[PDB]
Design a protein around this ligand. Structure first.
Ligand SMILES: [Mg+2]
Length: 494
């Protein structure tokens, strides 16, 4: 109806771009054959199950945009579009690459993401002008050796498929800079992967890799190496020191029991190292002695029972996550870690903290949730940069009076402890915003000085008896308690 007039409009305008997207089109009219001047046809977001043979009359088409339709194929007449440069077939119902697509040898850009494709035929070698090929989110089990004739490829995306291997002939696609293989079933990578010398983005997470080829050392433009969720427990001893632009290394969710063995400069370039969810039973002595730029270490969910003798020499570390290990002590040498801003120690077996904690002048966040802490050291008072202090689920009965010296503290989590009272010095926490006191069964009062925390907007007190406060006030909840402390206490300003 309106597409009749829009096709008609295009005819009289002689416009070389036709946009029929988002028009609920089920059947494309035959008359589209008349608009032979078109170089761009936009049919995306429609209801098309098929393109008519008349589309092959649009022999000047350079762009055919068909995403978000219900196509199963394309007309054999598309053969006649000898100038077609980009075909966009995302989000359709293709069970295979349409036969005609294998003859569109002028194509440089082919988008096939989100279909039902299982096989790439050997005839893929005909599309040797392709620089962008995306077949992400399909059902592909293997690629043909003839992928190696796509020598102009820059981006090859086959993420979210069923690949178990990659043909060694991928090593002939020497222009590739972005190769995404994540979320496949990959058991290995070919030793020829090193032939991809301009490789700068390699997607490998969520596969079944048990090793990395040593030839990957040749891909020295790589700026990230994310091996998350595989089956890796070692690395080629030469690999990391060859990746001289490597910024970040993720070994999370693998089966490392020991740090990978590497050169002296194995960690000399990365800023971030993520080894969370492995089986690592110790951190080697000296492992960060040449890691001047490494500032984030994540060791969460491993098997650590202690820390190396030179722990206190990690002077560049800024964020350290040792959550979900089996640490029983933090050594006094933690005083060495003068750059630390974030220290996460939740879910260990700590009973006390070293006095040396007080040397962490830049510490902003300290998370001690789910330990066995029985006290805090007085030297906590010197953490003047501390903003967030999480002590949830410990065995604390009192806090040091010096807790009130934490000028910058905004978040204080004391839920699930054994507290009998809060110090009056809580009132000098001028910046306190969130105070969690829930599930302290022996906490029977709150100090009037709590009224002095003018920025206090959240406090939890569920399952505290608070029997030294009036029953109806306690039943009113945090809002009523704070108002009561202000009105009955001695601190009203006027
Ligand atoms: Mg899958």
């Amino acid at each position: 109806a309106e597409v009749i007039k829009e096709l008609n409009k295009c005819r009289e305008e002689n416009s070389m771009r036709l946009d029929l997207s988002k028009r609920s089109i089920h059947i494309l009219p035959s008359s589209i054959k008349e608009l032979t001047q078109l170089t761009e046809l936009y049919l995306y977001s429609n209801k098309l199950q098929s393109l008519p043979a008349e589309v092959g009359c649009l022999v000047n088409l350079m762009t055919l945009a068909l995403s978000e339709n219900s196509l199963t194929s394309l007309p054999d007449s598309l053969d006649n579009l000898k100038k077609l440069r980009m075909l966009d077939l995302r989000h359709n119902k293709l069970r295979e690459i349409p036969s005609v697509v294998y003859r569109l040898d002028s194509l440089t850009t082919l988008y096939l993401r989100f279909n039902r494709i299982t096989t790439v035929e050997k005839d893929i070698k005909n599309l040797s002008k392709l620089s962008m090929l995306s077949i992400r989110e399909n059902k592909i089990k293997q690629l043909p050796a003839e992928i190696g004739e796509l020598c102009n490829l820059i981006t090859l995306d086959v993420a979210h498929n069923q690949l178990e291997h990659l043909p060694k002939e991928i090593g002939n696609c020497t222009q590739i800079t972005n190769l995404d293989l994540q979320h496949n079933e990959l058991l290995d990578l070919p030793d020829t992967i090193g032939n991809l010398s301009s490789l700068s983005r390699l997607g490998l997470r969520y596969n079944r890799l048990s090793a990395i080829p040593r030839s990957l050392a040749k891909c020295s433009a790589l700026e990230e190496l994310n091996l998350e969720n595989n089956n890796i427990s070692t690395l080629p001893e030469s690999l990391l020191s060859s990746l001289v632009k490597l910024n970040s290394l993720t070994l999370a969710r693998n089966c490392f029991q020991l740090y990978p063995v590497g050169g002296p400069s194995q960690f000399s370039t990365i800023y971030s190292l993520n080894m969370e969810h492995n089986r690592i039973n110790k951190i080697p002595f000296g492992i960060f002695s040449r890691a001047k730029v490494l500032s984030k270490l994540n060791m969460k969910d491993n098997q650590l029972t202690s820390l190396p003798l030179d722990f206190g020499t990690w002077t560049s570390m800024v964020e350290l996550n040792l959550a979900t290990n089996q640490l029983t002590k933090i050594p006094e040498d933690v005083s060495g870690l003068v750059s630390l801003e974030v220290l996460i120690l939740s879910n260990n077996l700590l009973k006390k903290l070293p006095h040396g904690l007080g040397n962490l002048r830049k510490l902003r966040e300290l998370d001690l949730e789910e330990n066995k802490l029985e006290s805090l050291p007085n030297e906590i008072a010197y953490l003047k940069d501390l903003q967030k202090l999480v002590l949830t689920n410990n065995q604390l009965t009192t806090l040091p009076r010096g807790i009130g010296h934490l000028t910058n503290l905004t978040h204080l989590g004391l839920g699930e402890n054994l507290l009998t009272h809060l110090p009056e010095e809580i009132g000098t926490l001028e910046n306190l915003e969130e105070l969690y006191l829930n599930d302290n069964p022996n906490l029977h009062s709150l100090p009037f000085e709590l009224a002095l925390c003018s920025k206090l907007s959240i406090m939890s007190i569920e399952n505290c008896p608070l029997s030294h406060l009036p029953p109806q006030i306690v039943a009113g909840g945090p809002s009523f308690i704070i108002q009561f402390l202000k009105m009955q206490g001695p601190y009203r300003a006027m």
